Amino acid sequence: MAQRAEGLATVLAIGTAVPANCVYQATYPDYYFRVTKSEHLADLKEKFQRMCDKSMIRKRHMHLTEEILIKNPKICAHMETSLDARHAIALVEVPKLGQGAAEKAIKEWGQPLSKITHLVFCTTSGVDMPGADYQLTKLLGLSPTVKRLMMYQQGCFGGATVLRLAKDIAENNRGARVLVVCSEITAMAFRGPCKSHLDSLVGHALFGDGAAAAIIGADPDQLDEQPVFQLVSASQTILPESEGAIDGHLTEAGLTIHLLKDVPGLISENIEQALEDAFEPLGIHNWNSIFWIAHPGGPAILDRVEDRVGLDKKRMRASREVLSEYGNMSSASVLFVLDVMRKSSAKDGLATTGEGKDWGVLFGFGPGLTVETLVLHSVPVP
Amino acid sequence: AQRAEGLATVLAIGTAVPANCVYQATYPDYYFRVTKSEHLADLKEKFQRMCDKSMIRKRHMHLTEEILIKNPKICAHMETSLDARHAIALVEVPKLGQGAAEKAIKEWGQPLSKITHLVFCTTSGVDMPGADYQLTKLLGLSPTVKRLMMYQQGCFGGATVLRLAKDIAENNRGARVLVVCSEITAMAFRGPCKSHLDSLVGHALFGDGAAAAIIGADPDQLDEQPVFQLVSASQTILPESEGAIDGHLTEAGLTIHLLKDVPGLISENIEQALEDAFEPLGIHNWNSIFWIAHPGGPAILDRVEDRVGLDKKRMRASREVLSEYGNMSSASVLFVLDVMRKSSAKDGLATTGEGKDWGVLFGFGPGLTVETLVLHSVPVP
Ligand SMILES: CC(C)(COP(=O)(O)OP(=O)(O)OC[C@H]1O[C@@H](n2cnc3c(N)ncnc32)[C@H](O)[C@@H]1OP(=O)(O)O)[C@@H](O)C(=O)NCCC(=O)NCCS
Ligand SMILES: CC(C)(COP(=O)(O)OP(=O)(O)OC[C@H]1O[C@@H](n2cnc3c(N)ncnc32)[C@H](O)[C@@H]1OP(=O)(O)O)[C@@H](O)C(=O)NCCC(=O)NCCS
Ligand SMILES: O=C1C[C@@H](c2ccc(O)cc2)Oc2cc(O)cc(O)c21
Numbered sequence: 058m059a060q061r062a063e064g065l066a067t068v069l070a071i072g073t074a075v076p077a078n079c080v081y082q083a084t085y086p087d088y089y090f091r092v093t094k095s096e097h098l099a100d101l102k103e104k105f106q107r108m109c110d111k112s113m114i115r116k117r118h119m120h121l122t123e124e125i126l127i128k129n130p131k132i133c134a135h136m137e138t139s140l141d142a143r144h145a146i147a148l149v150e151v152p153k154l155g156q157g158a159a160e161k162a163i164k165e166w167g168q169p170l171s172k173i174t175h176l177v178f179c180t181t182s183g184v185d186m187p188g189a190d191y192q193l194t195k196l197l198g199l200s201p202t203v204k205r206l207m208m209y210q211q212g213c214f215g216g217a218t219v220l221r222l223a224k225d226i227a228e229n230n231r232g233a234r235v236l237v238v239c240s241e242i243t244a245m246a247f248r249g250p251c252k253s254h255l256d257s258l259v260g261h262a263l264f265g266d267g268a269a270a271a272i273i274g275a276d277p278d279q280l281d282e283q284p285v286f287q288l289v290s291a292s293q294t295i296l297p298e299s300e301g302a303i304d305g306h307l308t309e310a311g312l313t314i315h316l317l318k319d320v321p322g323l324i325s326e327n328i329e330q331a332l333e334d335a336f337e338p339l340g341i342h343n344w345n346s347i348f349w350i351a352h353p354g355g356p357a358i359l360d361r362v363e364d365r366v367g368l369d370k371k372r373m374r375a376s377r378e379v380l381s382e383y384g385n386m387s388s389a390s391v392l393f394v395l396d397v398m399r400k401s402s403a404k405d406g407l408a409t410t411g412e413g414k415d416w417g418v419l420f421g422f423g424p425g426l427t428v429e430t431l432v433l434h435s436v437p438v439p
Numbered sequence: 440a441q442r443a444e445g446l447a448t449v450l451a452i453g454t455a456v457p458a459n460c461v462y463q464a465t466y467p468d469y470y471f472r473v474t475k476s477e478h479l480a481d482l483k484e485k486f487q488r489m490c491d492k493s494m495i496r497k498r499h500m501h502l503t504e505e506i507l508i509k510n511p512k513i514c515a516h517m518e519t520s521l522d523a524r525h526a527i528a529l530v531e532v533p534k535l536g537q538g539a540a541e542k543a544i545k546e547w548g549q550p551l552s553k554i555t556h557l558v559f560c561t562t563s564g565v566d567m568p569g570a571d572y573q574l575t576k577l578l579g580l581s582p583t584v585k586r587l588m589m590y591q592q593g594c595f596g597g598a599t600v601l602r603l604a605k606d607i608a609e610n611n612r613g614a615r616v617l618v619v620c621s622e623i624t625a626m627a628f629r630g631p632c633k634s635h636l637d638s639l640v641g642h643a644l645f646g647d648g649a650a651a652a653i654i655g656a657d658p659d660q661l662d663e664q665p666v667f668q669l670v671s672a673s674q675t676i677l678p679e680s681e682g683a684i685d686g687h688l689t690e691a692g693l694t695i696h697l698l699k700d701v702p703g704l705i706s707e708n709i710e711q712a713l714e715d716a717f718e719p720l721g722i723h724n725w726n727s728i729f730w731i732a733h734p735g736g737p738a739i740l741d742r743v744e745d746r747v748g749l750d751k752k753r754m755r756a757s758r759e760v761l762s763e764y765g766n767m768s769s770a771s772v773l774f775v776l777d778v779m780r781k782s783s784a785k786d787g788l789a790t791t792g793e794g795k796d797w798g799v800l801f802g803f804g805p806g807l808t809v810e811t812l813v814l815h816s817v818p819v820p
């Protein structure tokens with residue numbers, strides 16, 4: 058009873074990092090078909106051009122350069138034996154990018170490394186033992202007694218999952234300060250285009266690299282810590298009739314994506330039930346009276362959710378800015394959206410970190426099809 | 440009032456193994472025959488001495504000679520074989536987990552609708568959606584079950600799922616956590632090689648198994664009967680242990696690397712783990728507590744027994760699991776917990792923990808990581 062915290066798990070800091078290499082969407086169909094030596098696939102290239110034109114992405118950050126692809130031609134093939142070459146990149150770069158994000162969150166938070174009691178590391182980009190959690194513990198110099206959770210092969214709802222894990226840890230352990238880190242490197246999934254896998258082609262229009270980190274704790278110090286958001290509740294559901302809508306396989310040829318059914322339609326037709334299950338207990342029913350942190354999976358998911366739920370254009374603005382500037386960074390994306398939301402809220406002189414609203418919703422979407430729903434509370438901005 | 444009041448408790452434990460049983464006495468001959476490695480006579484003699492010292496009687500293995508004949512790339516030391524291994528393990532991991540979970544759910548006796556959370560742990564393959572999703576479908580759990588998928592975890596995973604379940608169960612009023620650890624050696628099984636004697640060690644020790652438990656805080660007085668209480672959970676990276684246990688998921692499947700004195704590293708650090716866990720409770724006699732030690736192999740249990748000064752009885756449940764199942768990675772400690780309460784009841788002892796009040800559970804794995812849980816027994820009539 059005295060070993061547990063009293064109040065709600067709170068986000069006390071958010072930091073983000075991306076590879077320096079920036080790939081512009083306007084020139085990407087030419088780049089992708091040239092470096093994979095696929096320019097004879099002219100009809101496929103035109104299909105890819107239309108996907109990039111509709112993507113609502115301006116740029117992505119990618120560790121993978123043409124120099125790396127030239128040294129790894131089997132990564133350029135659609136489905137060649139290449140997992141070992143991909144792991145040799147991702148098992149180093151995932152924790153290093155995570156280090157970049159974690160250092161920025163720790164600097165914002167301003168407390169000593171010794172106060173971090175727990176680490177949750179989440180990725181979809183390769184697996185190893187010991188894990189990225191161990192590697193980051195060594196890179197940052199965390200205490201050897203840090204309690205670690207290594208969340209591997211999670212997918213796009215992982216950002217929601219690490220907040221749900223951190224909420225229970227922070228609330229149940231007095232003094233606990235949880236470092237959460239999501240880090241994604243597309244070198245695990247990047248491959249040449251193929252007419253038989255148009256879903257892989259969609260992935261190559263959307264997926265980017267990035268890492269995000271947060272410090273989560275309950276009972277924040279009034280003077281030395283600064284709340285950004287509160288984590289109120291977390292729910293998860295498998296959508297009806299969604300079997301196989303999003304599958305991801307780690308194979309001899311790296312990570313491959315498989316899409317069936319209508320992912321935007323399945324999510325959009327179930328989202329209102331997720332909102333009601335989360336918000337009815339709080340007496341909230343106007344979805345325009347809350348701020349929105351939607352996983353920016355792609356423009357069709359944000360468009361169909363906005364349309365079906367009846368959102369004003371401003372609700373999806375922060376999610377769309379992440380999509381525009383970074384693409385889909387799988388598990389890291391929602392932490393980027395949280396960061397954009399609080400920064401743009403303060404910049405626009407609004408009264409709270411959540412666009413001047415009190416209550417907010419965070420959605421992750423991924424394989425299952427799984428929807429993770431978190432209720433958030435904003436904090437006042439001076 | 441959204442949070443639980445009391446301690447996370449184990450309310451049920453179930454286990455399952457593949458029916459295929461491989462006897463250790465005949466295993467060096469079987470292993471060298473099915474990997475077509477009979478020309479490696481000096482390697483076979485080294486393997487025979489590893490099996491003789493293993494203190495394993497039998498292991499359960501999904502992989503049969505019929506499956507190995509259909510998958511010759513798996514029999515080579517290092518051929519491209521991850522896809523063939525995944526085709527087996529991505530189906531059998533959740534299916535074996537189902538077997539363990541159904542037995543724990545039967546012991547518990549509550550409706551499936553009471554299960555609010557699922558934690559699935561494996562070291563045997565990865566996929567999206569995960570084994571957590573597959574098991575949700577196999578059991579008929581509610582679509583609103585809150586899942587944690589713990590992939591590529593290693594031998595401390597059994598301790599980690601209890602640490603996770605403790606925080607979930609204590610922080611969520613009414614929460615009932617199903618935890619499942621399930622391991623299939625099809626991911627790691629390969630032919631022998633003179634350059635990789637640590638792989639030979641793995642082939643002497645690793646077996647298949649799944650274990651499940653139901654965890655909850657504030658057990659219903661009428662409907663639920665506790666087995667063990669989860670008091671505290673700690674984790675540490677051992678000093679000077681960099682590279683002691685590495686595990687790579689490669690084009691050729693899961694490969695193990697041992698690059699130190701694993702038994703010496705664990706035994707040199709275990710007393711400090713005991714003191715960190717038990718000094719706050721005023722406990723100093725390590726023979727006054729029950730022991731749930733990950734049966735990583737006989738040298739770990741021997742060196743810990745020797746360094747800490749344990750009576751032979753303390754490691755008995757851990758050695759029975761090693762004997763009857765081998766090292767089942769993350770599942771092993773839940774097998775030991777089950778053996779401990781069953782043999783405690785059979786011997787007419789006054790608690791689930793060999794008649795003791797307090798116990799310790801240790802997982803060991805890559806890092807080198809040691810996970811330490813403090814347990815409390817419950818009275819037995
Ligand atoms: C791809 C995308 C950015 C642009 O598509 P759009 O706005 O629908 O535009 P259009 O449908 O007019 O054209 C896009 C092309 O992509 C194709 N396409 C879209 N989704 C596809 C899929 N899953 N598999 C195959 N092709 C697909 C269309 O068939 C079309 O090809 P065409 O021009 O040769 O007919 C958009 O469809 C999208 O956001 N997709 C959903 C997001 C998503 O699935 N996220 C998953 C992340 S896990
Ligand atoms: C393998 C084991 C059963 C053999 O028992 P033992 O008492 O060491 O037996 P011996 O020393 O008489 O012989 C064992 C043989 O295995 C070899 N061996 C043991 N551990 C080894 C390792 N990590 N790498 C390579 N060879 C190893 C020994 O050198 C010896 O070979 P030899 O006959 O050519 O000298 C025992 O050492 C053990 O329990 N080790 C496992 C502990 C462990 O690391 N488990 C990790 C799982 S996570
Ligand atoms: O195949 C992939 C790629 C992966 C990914 C994206 C961005 C990044 O930087 C790294 C990995 O995200 C995914 C997320 C899924 O739910 C299913 C998937 O199949 C995949």
Ligand SMILES: O=C1C[C@@H](c2ccc(O)cc2)Oc2cc(O)cc(O)c21
Pocket residue numbers: 186562563592593594622623624625626627641645646647648684685686687693694695696766767768804805
């Ligand atoms: O390579 C393996 C095999 C794996 C395993 C054991 C039993 C089983 O049934 C399935 C997988 O356990 C491990 C545990 C480790 O800490 C490191 C490892 O490298 C491995």
